[PDB]
Amino acid sequence: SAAFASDNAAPAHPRVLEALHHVNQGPAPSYGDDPVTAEAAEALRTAFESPGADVLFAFTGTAANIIALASAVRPWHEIFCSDVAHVLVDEAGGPVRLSGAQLTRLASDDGLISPDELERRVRGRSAVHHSQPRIVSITQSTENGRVWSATAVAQFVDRAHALGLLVHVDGARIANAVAALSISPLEAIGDADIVSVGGTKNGLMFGDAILVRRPAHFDGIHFVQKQIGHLASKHRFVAAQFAGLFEGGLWLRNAAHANAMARRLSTGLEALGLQLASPTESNEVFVKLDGEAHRRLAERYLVHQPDPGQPVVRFVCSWSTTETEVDDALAALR
Amino acid sequence: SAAFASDNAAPAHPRVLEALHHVNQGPAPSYGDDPVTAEAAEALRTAFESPGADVLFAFTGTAANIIALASAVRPWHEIFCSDVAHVLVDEAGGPVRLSGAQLTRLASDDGLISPDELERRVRGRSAVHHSQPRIVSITQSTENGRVWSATAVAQFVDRAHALGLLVHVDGARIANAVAALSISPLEAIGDADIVSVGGTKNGLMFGDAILVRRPAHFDGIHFVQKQIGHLASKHRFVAAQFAGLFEGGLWLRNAAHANAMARRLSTGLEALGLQLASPTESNEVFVKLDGEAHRRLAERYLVHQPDPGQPVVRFVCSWSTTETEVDDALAALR
Amino acid sequence: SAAFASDNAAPAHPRVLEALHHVNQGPAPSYGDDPVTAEAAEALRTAFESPGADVLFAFTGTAANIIALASAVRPWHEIFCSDVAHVLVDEAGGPVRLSGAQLTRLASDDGLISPDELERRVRGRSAVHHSQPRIVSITQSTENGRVWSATAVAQFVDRAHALGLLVHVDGARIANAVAALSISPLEAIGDADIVSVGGTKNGLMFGDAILVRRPAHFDGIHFVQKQIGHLASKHRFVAAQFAGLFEGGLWLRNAAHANAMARRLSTGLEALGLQLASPTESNEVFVKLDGEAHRRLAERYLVHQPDPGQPVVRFVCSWSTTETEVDDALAALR
Amino acid sequence: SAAFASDNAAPAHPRVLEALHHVNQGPAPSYGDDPVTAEAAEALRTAFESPGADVLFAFTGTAANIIALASAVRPWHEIFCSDVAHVLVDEAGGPVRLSGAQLTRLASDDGLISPDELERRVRGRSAVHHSQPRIVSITQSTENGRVWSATAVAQFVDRAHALGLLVHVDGARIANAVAALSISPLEAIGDADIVSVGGTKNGLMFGDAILVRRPAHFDGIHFVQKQIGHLASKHRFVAAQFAGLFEGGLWLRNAAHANAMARRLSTGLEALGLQLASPTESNEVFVKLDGEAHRRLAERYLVHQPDPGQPVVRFVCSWSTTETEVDDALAALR
Prior knowledge:
Distance between the termini of chain A: 17 Å
Oligomer: homotetramer
Number of helices of chain A: 14
Entry title: Crystal structure of threonine aldolase from Mycobacterium vanbaalenii
Strand order of the largest sheet of chain A: 1-7-6-5-4-2-3
Keywords: Aldolase, threonine, PLP, transferase
PDB class: transferase
Assembly: tetrameric
Structural class of chain A: alpha/beta
Radius of gyration of chain A: 20 Å
Chains A, B, C, D: L-threonine aldolase
Order of helices and strands of chain A: HHEHEHHEHEHEHHEEHHHEHEH
Largest interface: C-D, 55 and 53 residues
């Protein structure tokens, strides 16, 4: 079963399909010049309290990240990210291929990067022989299931800005961080210049948006989107998914349920005597499992081992995860 | 009204939305490792009588073309296309950016390229100082609304193959060519090596497939797809659309209706005394209209002028175009 | 014999070797941070009466062209050139690979492009779906041995600027144009924004400079130079070559001699009854030769056939070409 | 004074100028189709006891590295290097920009990488979502002035080969490693697949070669060289430099002298009570200096500080360094 393989193993929320049906009549001008796209863009700007932002819509989170970062840099610039960042490990090098720029990893505590580590790797890089530090990407919630605190994300973004850098937030799971912290979306991303806003993992069929809070720094981003095939002609159907998910606060209720199920699973794993590899602050559970328990669990449940050198497996819960599924996975581990 | 702006102005066929609902239950392994993807791939292999083909699915036709062409070449190779090709004029240079290779236009008659024109531009290019001819892209039906005959597409592909070149077919509107010619899909592509198979324009919500008839020549195509963000995690939803549209020949009924409405419009405007710029062989009608007549028509219908140096406007008919819409367009053109 | 293969088949001028010896003592700060580089940069600025220009030095004419054009554009821009341009046909697509941008050929008369042809191919290209016209490259003297007149080059540059475009001049053979026209270097380039200044073909050992007349439009050009390996550590030796060749106008005397030998050859060929393919306005002679005569000439002289479909061969004369070599070639053609 | 800024601050050896003069007569076929290029290539193959190798010549060491690595990979592959590698820190990201591939740093001891560290970072990287490990670059002697022992380089290359990876050696200072170890050049590179062979730093004017020991793995390398402007038309002059430097062991005498001066300087610094940051095994001396002493030395000697966060400065000795220069630097530090 793929019930815990990823939150992208989940189906789509019925309200998303309903939104697709609602816009499925009559002709519509293509490529985003339609009222549904305008409505969805305004919904995202309002949610993040960023009335001056531009909003683009891509089909995957990989695409959202590549478009944001490649529009931020020239090839002789330098991009920074954590040592567990999706852009670094799970996009087959897409960001580097499109940007032409080096992607420099930073030591992190489960994705949480110290401002001092960034400062150390940016210092003294002004010669023509050096890639030029330009933008740092962080992830919220992180790829190891942690959440940046309101204070920590504000301090990191402010410190990066003081160094003359831009900040990108990979919010493929931003809804899970917002629900976990009970703060505003804007507080959860901390004055970032650009944000990949995840939809796919939170109940869409597909779709990951780009909130460009400071458009002056990303000139040409719409051309970059076009050049990699992510400007949809039938754009009403990507936009309608976001409208349906954000209608009435549904997106944060979806993420809160995913988080609650992850908490149930994590508590159950600890009750079995197992050790968490990372604290369950979001909708992802990382647990230490020996080889045979892993292979026995794998006969019933598909789970990811993010690091081949560490006996740690990952469970991910979604908007559609049930208490019965959690308890059945735990029974499988016993 | 956008009723004739493009076939991508049309909504999605009801069977497509039904297919989305049918696969929207339970968790599913992601990134194409699911039975619906396997079913859709087999539907495409069967339609094109290509049992040895691999099948990939991208979100747009631009993406399909970029993935096919960039996977065929190294940066020092040379790609050829017609002087009206979508890859040349309407993808913001995406194919060139991703492949790293020069894209060389060939003189054509409404997209129909002579084999001799290709051969002339391929001759004598073997020195280290020259981009190395590798693949030619043709479009079926063409961007100017013409269809390559079965004989013509076979001679062109045969000439390219005799010269050692690969052939890509941009079949964004392959269903319209097949319906117009009443030949098999394989006959309509003439032994080509790779084909972008259009879905969006023929009634899907999103989705354009890549039929790789000779996989040995496109090593790494799956990495190219991943690197530009076109490997969907919830792949069951792109696949379900293709399975539904190809079930029982629906795709060709959609295209036949679009072609028939184009016939009604084309013959009707000729009856008005207006003149065609190109023969209506598919679902696109190109009509000579001066600037003032165009501005008067633009008050009721959005239509594109593909060439700013030519007083020619384009109407496109779709699976959902009605006789009432065609006749109202004729009343506006009168 | 390679006497007429190219002007880059010639040796290096004695003054160039003397200049290399002159700077070959003691340690010197690297990467251009030395007085010889400053002296050479000033010599080039003075020759082209461009006191506000920046000057870079690269190792080949291909490199000079790539650095200039790639620094001018983003990947979604569009570069224009003539249908015989070196950047198009003889750099294995280097400019396209490094810039990421489409290179669009323009019909020309032996490299001389009409302003109207540029204007036609730039019109109406403002949509997100289109590569964005940015810079046109012309060649002076052209790859077919013609010279842009002072009036023609000024008018072409003025039209390109009125269209919002930049202009690059590939002056791999700028010295020959200047000597042929008896005008100033600045008049021969017509207020262009960036110029590749040829040294190699006019008697250097290696070296081709970039005169950046409007640096604001080429931000990052020094990083582009560094990134492709064309920032010499021992920069005193590239600079010394240029200083020696330009001292006292030697560069123009070298080119005038090359042009005079080309005229001797061209008129002698016409006296033999042969027909020129292009008028000999510079140091290159293009002559029609049947297959029979060509395969003979090839046993005694290496000559280039630029177009495989046309019975045309090219002779190139250099600063070191002698009247005896010219007359012996003419005697071989009897 | 630039006496210790770098070995590329040194002038050119007299034998190099003699070689340039010797080949400077008559016309010569261009782009490497001359006997001097053949002679130089044979000299390099003989020095490295690699009769099956192909040999290319570029103008800089940055270019040599970029051409070797970019020809080894497709964009979805992964390149590895040490955390102090020139390709990583001092080429403005050129290798990444050309290859399109991620460049992954490995923890090292002054550039000496443990085989286990490579193996750890290569493990489990087979999914479509991952950059695909392909080639590791090591440097000999290293950027921190250390030499790989014969045993260590052989074990590292064998370990890499068993993992299915290629090995590139940046031998910008290979002559210094060979002289320090008193082993053969081939033993000093340990069966590597491709080697950048430094000439510039060992007394040439310009020029750094590529020894392609296994050409089957670098298909298209000559096109890559052409595309970044590093195929010299007047190729006889780069080839003549290499032939002159390698005749009769001159290159190793130059390197042995540079190493001897580095030893004099290093022993002198230790005698002053100063502390080395790295052991002086080659021609580079890395010494800890507090701010006061560094500021006084910088008024008198130009020296590099490789890490802005460490109070460590670098002296480099060359073929032309004299005992007087070393002793005066030591006296200045007093």
